[PDB]
Amino acid sequence: MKVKIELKFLGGLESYLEDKSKNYVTLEIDSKELNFENLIAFIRDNIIEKKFVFSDYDIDEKLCKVMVDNKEYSNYNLKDKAKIKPGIIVLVNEYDWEILGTYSYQIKNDDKICFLSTL
């Protein structure tokens, strides 16, 4: 189903965004396979411009089109999986993702996700 979310970056993570005029991007995806594992892998390689600061390079391809603000990407790998780097706090709608089921959380249309570095 159609999912439009906000991805906010805090604690210094915003300095690695393509658009440095704001600390967030909007992501649009029309796939039932969207999850935090493929979302973290995609942010790691396409939204965060600096290497090693967001997620480890721990890890098949099933690619899909996504919108990041007004830019289309065709390399969103629904089969990729990545863990958030320790020291990065994840919030969904300002709730700690630990009370949401972390990686098992079903991301929903209009969710506001925040990544806050303590590193």
- The CATH number for 72's domain is 3.10.20.30
**Burial of 101: CB neighbours in 10 Å, binned 0-12, 13-18, 19+:** exposed
Resolution (A): 1.9
| Residue numbers of the domain that contains 70 | 2-119
Distances (CA, A) of 97 to 21, 70, 72, 113: 27, 27, 28, 9
User: How many domains, the chain?
Assistant: 1
Token pair listed for 20 = 């440095």
The method recorded for this entry reads X-ray
DSSP at 72: E
- In 3D space, the residue among 15, 2, 8 whose CA is nearest the CA of residue 91 turns out to be 8
Rounded Cα distance between 59 and 69, Å, is: 27
Q: 50 and 20 in contact (C-beta within 8 Å)?
A: no
Q: How far apart are CA 111 and CA 61, in angstroms?
A: 26
